[PDB]
Amino acid sequence: LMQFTLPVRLCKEIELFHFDIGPFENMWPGIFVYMVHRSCGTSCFELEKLCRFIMSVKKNYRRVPYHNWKHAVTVAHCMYAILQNNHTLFTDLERKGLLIACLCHDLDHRGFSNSYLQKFDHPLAALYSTSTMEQHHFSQTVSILQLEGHNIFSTLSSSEYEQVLEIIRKAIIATDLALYFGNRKQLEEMYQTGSLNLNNQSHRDRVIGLMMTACDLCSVTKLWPVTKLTANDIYAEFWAEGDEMKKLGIQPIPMMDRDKKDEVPQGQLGFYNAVAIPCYTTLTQILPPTEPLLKACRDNLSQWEKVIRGEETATW
Ligand SMILES: CNCCN(C)C(=O)c1cnn(C)c1C(=O)Nc1ccn2cc(-c3ccccc3)nc2c1
Ligand SMILES: [Mg+2]
Ligand SMILES: [Zn+2]
């Protein structure tokens, strides 16, 4: 066999939740295949079809500051770390589906929220009334899977193919943060009443949904220099959207107004308290080995507090 291998530092550090995939774009396909081979198996996919699939997915991500090809592979790496540290808990189809779902979860993102597409009256908003961009990301995934020589699931039965596409659809839709609040609340109530049941498919769907949020937000679980620099890319998009809202004659929300840049540290503190900490808290309760994501999130919360107190300086 031809096994994928990484340099010694990457081989060790890729197993860490806080791993950064680095600035060499040409290494990310190899990093992804390496993670598929270890988390799924060398027989899960035909290498030729998987490589062709990866390069078509890359081509359908756009040159935007944050929702780009690097984000796709970064979210996949976080899923890899969750799967490898919980390897008894997931099925063969979930291992085949979830790294692919992560790679594809923001396909053809233009750096604009569902709200902006609604206000602009974009054709996508007419086609998909809720989770507009996420329904688009899934449609783009199906289009690529149906290209000649791109059926990476060709050895699955019709019923198994339908199952894995359902895992991918639900996982991509779960990255709509509007749906996270309800999903985490349901999971919190289920865990605390001891009703949570990983044999229940509707429960598995919710746990996978929370895993997808955890992976999607994972910049907050990196080492501080990575967290701080990624925040610059996130705001580059938010502020471009705020400019476009102002062009429509609509006041943007504070996080999208570039004139409010001095309030970013307090905005981050608000986001960590309201979204990130609860997300990784609930995930650790369900999957204790994901603890390092929560620890790293708490460490970054403390860094943003230091910035607010003027002990740290967050420059753009
Ligand atoms: C997942 N899709 C949803 C979009 N998205 C990618 C995220 O929300 C996301 C993902 N990772 N991170 C780190 C974030 C993030 O930073 N979010 C927020 C969330 C709320 N805010 C409020 C203020 C703020 C700024 C200035 C003034 C007042 C308020 N700033 C923020 C920032
Ligand atoms: Mg998205
Ligand atoms: Zn994303």
Tab-separated table of C-alpha atoms and ligand atoms in Angstrom, residues 105-106 109 134 137 175, ligand 2:
chain	number	residue	atom	x	y	z
A	105	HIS	CA	-19.874	22.434	5.178
A	106	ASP	CA	-19.197	26.000	3.802
A	109	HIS	CA	-19.585	30.747	0.900
A	134	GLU	CA	-26.350	25.778	4.738
A	137	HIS	CA	-23.596	24.152	0.973
A	175	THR	CA	-23.637	24.524	11.305
B	2	MG	MG	-21.349	28.013	7.633
